[PDB]
Every structure is written in structure tokens, then in C-alpha cells.
Design a protein around this nucleic acid. Sequence first.
DNA 1: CTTAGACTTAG
DNA 2: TCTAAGTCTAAG
Length: 243
Amino acid sequence: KNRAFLKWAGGKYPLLDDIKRHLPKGECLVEPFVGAGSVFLNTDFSRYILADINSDLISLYNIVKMRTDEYVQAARELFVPETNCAEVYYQFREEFNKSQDPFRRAVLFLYLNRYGYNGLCRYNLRGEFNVPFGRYKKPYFPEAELYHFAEKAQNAFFYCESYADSMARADDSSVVYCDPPYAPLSSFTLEQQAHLAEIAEGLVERHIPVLISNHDTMLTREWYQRAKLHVVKVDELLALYKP
DNA sequence: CTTAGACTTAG
DNA sequence: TCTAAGTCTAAG
Ligand SMILES: C[S@@+](CC[C@H](N)C(=O)[O-])C[C@H]1O[C@@H](n2cnc3c(N)ncnc32)[C@H](O)[C@@H]1O
């Protein structure tokens, strides 16, 4: 199983097998919430349409794809013991927030993801990244994962946009996999959760299969009632809209 | 998760 | 615009 190079909230690593078991065959895989890209990195579609509302994430992905060798060499320099301290971290954070250069920002973004607290990505209303120092003994430099990503990215387009716009990119040859922000246990509003479900319904009647994962709650069962539900116990829910 | 600082609003 | 409750927000 190919691991992602970012430490990202909600890694689909433990559930890959269950996702891949219910993911229909197609020419193209569309992911409105690509995040770290676990499913992308562990499937074999001829092409991918990958999207996310986080512009730093999408920008990072475009650069890793287009300037791999240059990026890896520059990012590797930041993963030395000399950078594993608060003062250095907070300066790199300030450099990130003040940089107007996508490359340098992409470089620093990997550093902050790995050295900051628990791989969080938080912004203030001014758009400034304000995650505190993570206090790790030895952050890991995901070189092997970076190279694998760029290689696999040659068949992927990246778009910064909301789920409604990326799902509209789907066609008869497409399969849609949705990994929305988690529903509440018994940000991403309840309206948007429900709205996502009705878009899936719209796609399944245009003969476009859609797979959605989320927590297994009373709310998710209601939003996804038009779909064939599958429960994964450890509890996760897979909602399959198949023509 | 937690605390601090600040702004908005009812009374 | 008093005063304090109410709400929002930033960041370790
Ligand atoms: C990582 S997936 C969900 C993983 C897991 N379910 C969790 O919440 O921990 C969430 C991703 O969707 C993206 N996202 C949030 N809102 C979005 C929206 N309205 N449209 C498209 N992408 C969005 C975020 O950037 C985030 O990276």
C-alpha cells in the first residue's frame, strides 16, 4: 500500500481495501475531496480528476507534479535536525505566510505539515497558517512517497474548487469517489453534507456511479438513503450510488 | 483541547 | 455611548 507524503487528517489508509472493493470500474476517477490522495495513490484508473477547496494543497500538488526533482532537493534541505526547534519553525511559518512564491510556499508547506502539531492545516481569517510547533523527535522526509506521487500524477489534473464544480466534471466514463469532512458523532455544514448526497443522486441517473464514505450515524443513513449502504466495523459507512 | 483577547449587543 | 453578557477569534 502506497502511503501519502502528507500527514493529513482522515487518511483513508485503514479502509482502502473496503473502498476498493466497492469502487466501480471506469476510465476516470473523480475525487471532489482529494485530501492526501490515499485512494488516488492505490488505484489504477487511466486518468484522474482531483479537486479540493484548499488552494495551498492543490498548488503543492501541481508543483510536485511539474517540478519533481527541483522540489525534492529543495524540500529535503528543510528536514535536518537544525530545523527541529520552535524558533526556526515559527520563522518558517512566517516566511510561508509572507511568501508570494508558489514553489517556496509548496516547499515550506511540506515542512509545516511534518513539523507542526499533528499534521493540522489551520488558517486565521486573514488566510494565515497558524498551527503551533509539533515537538516531534524526528520528522520523516517522505522522499519515496513524493516521487511515487509525481509519477502517478502524470495522469491526473488538479483543480482548486468546491465539490459541486468538480462533480460536474464527471461524464459517463467517470467514477466519483467522495471523502467528505466527517459528519458529527452522535466547517462543513449539515446542509453541505445533505447537498452532496443530492448531487450524487443527480449523477447516478446520468449513469455515473458515485461512492461516498462517512461515519455511520443516523444522519448519514438518512442523507444516503437512495444508495446501497455498506457498513465497515472496526464504524464507517460506504454509500454506493450505482446505475 | 484550552485560554486569552476583542468586538457586538441587549438592557 | 454605561456595563456586562454574549459571541467571535487567534493561537499555543
Ligand atoms: C481529508 S477529506 C476528509 C477526511 C476525513 N473524512 C476527515 O474529515 O477527517 C477533507 C478534505 O476536503 C476538503 N474540503 C473541505 N471542504 C470542501 C468543499 N466544500 N469542497 C471541496 N473540498 C472540500 C478539505 O480541504 C480537506 O482536505
